[PDB]
Design a protein around this ligand. Structure first.
Ligand code: LWJ
Length: 282
């Protein structure tokens, strides 16, 4: 019983549903998504409700779609493409990232495609994520769960921020699909005082920087929740990755400032990474 929005509405028959992607998201083919090109197909990602869908789970999908409509377009985020709101279940149509999440993408390219990423490719990857986040921050949006698992990669190797429109009950002991604790990406003030800001997202970006330069490495391996809490209270910080400059590790450390006001902004991280990209050899 959703109202139609002709800005985004795609007839249900223009969407050829395919294989599942996300754990609910499916790969699909959209015919004539762009009005100027009606005889062309576009590979898209389709988000829809599960069988045991709650009325809150439905309201959250609507909120996510309405949020995506307002945020606007940027090259380094997953963009809204359309929606099927009439005569059936709600479908939210977004951009498809063929190469999947950043963590796997980096893991697949570790030394023994599988083609080794150069140091310029690594600094460029961080620059694109910083650019996506800078855009979201300018739109007054706080991610709250920034990590390489939530950075998706396109066929053209473009980094796009994903799952930024989430409406948030947080289980600290719950592990991800690969057995990792999300609390390892949380700023201490967000973790202990539940204070989520653009500054707490910058902290998460520091952990993401560490993920990039370890090629999908797991932060704090073998550290349980209770022991992580102790490390943070003591002011413990992760070690410099192997194959990481002192400048880029200083950047990580700045992102992890105990005082949120003293951390760099995404605007500053974009300018610094723009300069480092130009001075890094491929
Ligand atoms: C704010 C927001 N709403 C969203 C709604 C859905 C998605 N979303 N979820 C998955 C995907 C893929 O492209 C995708 C998954 C996958 C797995 C293996 C190989 C290739 C792949 N591509 C996507 N775009 C991100 C969203 N961000």
């Amino acid at each position: 019983e959703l109202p139609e929005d002709p800005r985004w509405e795609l007839p249900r028959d223009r969407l050829v549903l395919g294989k599942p992607l996300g754990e609910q998201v499916v790969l699909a083919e959209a015919i004539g998504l762009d009005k100027d090109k009606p005889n062309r197909v576009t590979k898209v990602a389709v988000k829809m409700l599960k069988s045991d869908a709650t009325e809150k789970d439905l309201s959250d999908l609507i909120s996510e779609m309405e949020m995506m409509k307002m945020i606007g377009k940027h090259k380094n985020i997953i963009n809204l493409l359309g929606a099927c709101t009439q005569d059936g279940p709600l479908y939210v149509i977004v951009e498809y990232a063929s190469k999947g999440n950043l963590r796997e993408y980096l893991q697949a390219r570790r030394p023994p495609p599988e083609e080794q990423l150069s140091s310029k490719d690594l600094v460029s990857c961080a620059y694109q994520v910083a650019r996506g986040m800078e855009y979201l921050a300018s739109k007054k949006c706080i991610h709250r769960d920034l990590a390489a698992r939530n950075v998706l990669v396109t066929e053209d190797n473009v980094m796009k921020i994903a799952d930024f429109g989430l409406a948030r009950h947080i289980d600290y002991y719950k592990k991800t699909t690969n057995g990792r604790l999300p609390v390892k990406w949380m700023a201490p003030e967000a973790l202990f005082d539940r204070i989520y800001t653009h500054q707490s997202d910058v902290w998460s970006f520091g952990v993401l920087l560490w993920e990039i330069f370890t090629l999908g490495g797991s932060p704090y391996p073998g550290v349980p929740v209770e022991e992580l809490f102790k490390l943070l209270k003591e002011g413990h910080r992760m070690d410099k990755p192997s194959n990481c400059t002192n400048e880029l590790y200083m950047m990580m450390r700045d992102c992890w400032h105990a005082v949120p006001s003293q951390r760099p902004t995404f605007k500053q991280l974009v300018e610094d990474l723009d300069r480092i990209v130009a001075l890094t050899s491929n």
